[PDB]
């Protein structure tokens, strides 16, 4: 069932994730603080968190078997397009359905609809994002499946601007097979029912969220006063 190589891929992705995701959120204290009374009083803090998250996503992606072996240009495009999606995925670990919020260890760092509203966004985006998280949490994925889904998301050959798609596809196919085989031999019924199919449908939902966020990011960042509240890395990665 699970070949050595596939076990090796999982071993590497789990190590990578462990090294890029602190489930105590200790570093949150170094962000500009959250204000939950400009109207966007949660923008500074949430931009900082996003920025931070982008750095961790980059660290995770560098450990994806083969990813470092792509050209820089393809590494850059893949990361630019996926960053928001991987941050959304990786956020499922703090998300809680108790009260539909992202619970990052304390009340100060517990984010709900109103916080995200205080970051400049609307309910037309915020609602599908909570719906996304609910559906994804309902999957109750194993950590091995979760890290696999993040990597499969990063190594997508249809991202606009990808130069060597045959090589990106090669990587993702390996991750995909490993994921499919993992579920077959590790994920026991009845949680494994059409599990791959639901996980890949989450990748589709993420593209849709990506598209719409890009639109709102475009209207937010268009105002220089709001752009001023973002980070240099965020400006680079999402654009100006």
């Amino acid at each position: 069932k699970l070949s050595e190589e596939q076990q090796h891929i999982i071993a590497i992705l789990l190590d990578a994730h462990h090294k890029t995701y602190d489930p105590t959120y200790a570093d949150f204290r170094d962000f500009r603080p959250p204000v939950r009374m400009s109207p966007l009083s949660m923008l500074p803090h949430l931009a900082d968190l996003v920025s931070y998250s982008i750095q961790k996503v980059i660290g995770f992606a560098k450990m994806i078997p083969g990813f470092r072996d792509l050209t820089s240009d393809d590494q850059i495009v893949l990361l630019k397009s996926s960053a928001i999606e991987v941050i959304m995925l990786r956020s499922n670990q703090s998300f809680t359905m108790d009260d539909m919020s992202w619970d990052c260890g304390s009340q100060d760092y517990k984010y709900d609809v109103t916080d995200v509203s205080k970051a400049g966004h609307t309910l037309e985006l915020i609602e599908p994002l909570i719906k996304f998280q609910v559906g994804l949490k309902k999957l109750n994925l194993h950590e091995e499946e979760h890290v696999l889904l993040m990597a499969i998301c990063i190594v997508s050959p249809d991202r606009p601007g990808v130069q060597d798609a045959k090589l990106v596809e090669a990587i993702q196919d390996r991750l995909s097979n490993t994921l499919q085989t993992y579920i077959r031999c590790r994920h026991p019924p009845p949680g494994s029912h059409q599990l791959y199919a639901k996980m890949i449908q989450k990748l589709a939902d993420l593209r849709s969220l990506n598209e719409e966020h890009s639109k709102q990011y475009r209207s937010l960042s268009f105002q220089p006063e709001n752009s001023m509240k973002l980070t240099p890395l965020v400006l680079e990665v999402f654009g100006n």
Binding site: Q55, I58, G59, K62, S72, D73, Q75, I76, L79, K80, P232, L233, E236, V237
Partner: peptide
Amino acid sequence: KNHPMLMNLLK
């Protein structure tokens, strides 16, 4: 393309 901060965190 260019992306000095992104590129630098990758190397």
